[PDB]
């Protein structure tokens, strides 16, 4: 009865942007992983530190379901030890990350004839994100010697850029929905079991 609410994470009507990545917490629920096995509609499925088969018989203190959207050329950056705009400025996973990365093409849902621009991503940042960090500040990035007092212009750019998602875009630029499951096990009771 108390099955973990994975449905509302994967089958969510709408998703969030990578810089504003959404996080859901899974605790106190039997973890039925049969939805990942049966659903063959997944393009990329890579787990690190743990295996999926020996996961329905293993408990955890808590699970985190992070959700966001990127383009196909960046899906490879969703993994430990990766570098790039997404890895460095929007969503970073730790080198010792323990979980699973799933990504599927959502070109049918996150594209408009005039171009769907509602999904954004951070373009500039003075430093790289720490693991599991969410930066949502809209501060004007200072690229030059002249300080920017909240105003844009010469070497003063808005840090967020919008994706160009059209039905005719190349597969490398089509939209992809990404779900990242991370498992934690501490010196505390385990509420999530398979």
């Amino acid at each position: 009865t108390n099955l973990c609410p994975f449905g509302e994470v994967f089958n969510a009507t709408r998703f969030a942007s990578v810089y504003a990545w959404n996080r859901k917490r899974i605790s106190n629920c039997v973890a039925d992983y049969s939805v990942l096995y049966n659903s063959a509609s997944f393009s990329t499925f890579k787990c690190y530190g743990v295996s999926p088969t020996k996961l329905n018989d293993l408990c955890f203190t808590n699970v985190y379901a992070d959700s966001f959207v990127i383009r196909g050329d960046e899906v490879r950056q969703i993994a430990p030890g990766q570098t790039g705009k997404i890895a460095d400025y929007n969503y970073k996973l730790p080198d010792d990350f323990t979980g699973c990365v799933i990504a599927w093409n959502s070109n049918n849902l996150d594209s408009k004839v005039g171009g769907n621009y509602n999904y954004l991503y951070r373009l500039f940042r003075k430093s790289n994100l720490k693991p599991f960090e969410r930066d949502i500040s809209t501060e004007i990035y200072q690229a030059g010697s002249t300080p920017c007092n909240g105003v844009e212009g010469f070497n003063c750019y808005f840090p967020l850029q919008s994706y160009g998602f059209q039905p005719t875009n190349g597969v490398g630029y089509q939209p992809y929905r990404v779900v990242v499951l991370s498992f934690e096990l501490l010196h505390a009771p385990a509420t999530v079991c398979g």
Partner: antibody
Amino acid sequence: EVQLVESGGGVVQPGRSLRLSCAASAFTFSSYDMHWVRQAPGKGLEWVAVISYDGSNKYYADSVKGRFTISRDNSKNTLYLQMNSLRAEDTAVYYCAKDGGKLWVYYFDYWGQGTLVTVSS
Amino acid sequence: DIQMTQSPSSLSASVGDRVTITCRASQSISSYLNWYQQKPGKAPKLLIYAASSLQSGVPSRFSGSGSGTDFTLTISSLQPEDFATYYCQQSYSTLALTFGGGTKVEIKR
């Protein structure tokens, strides 16, 4: 005393299909994840496919994804590998391997002697 | 993907020598590095798992070590039945299992 016996290997034209079968003995075959690993003549080992103990999960590497299929029959204590759309790169000796399940990750406990598969016409 | 560089490509040692083989990974793997052996023609055989865990039924003279990227496999005293090709295999990339190049230990002559 754990025994794995591969069979079904032969020579086959490119684009054809073949069926490898592994027979397990002397251990609970239905309670372990099973692996297939191939080695090309003169090359090293390369991971191919994995199936869960209950036969509900099936995972493959990128080089054969959507091309090979891995299944199992617990009642008959066997592990099947259907190789459809075989290419020249697929020419190798294929082994079936038990997992062990002692860690959170995959490691290969016992190896069968393998069966040869060559792709020519 | 993850590439496993295994060195030396091929070493020469005599019986009783303290043999050591290095395996380096492109990225970080916690301790999920396993060491296998294969005689010519025969099937591979498991030696070490979880980077320093000796498998049941293996002589104690084999020992693994190392964490992160640099891993080492050591035979304290070589024996005649140990001349084979040893591979190192990472597992951290669970669904992207990769093997090293191997290090054939020849009868140094």
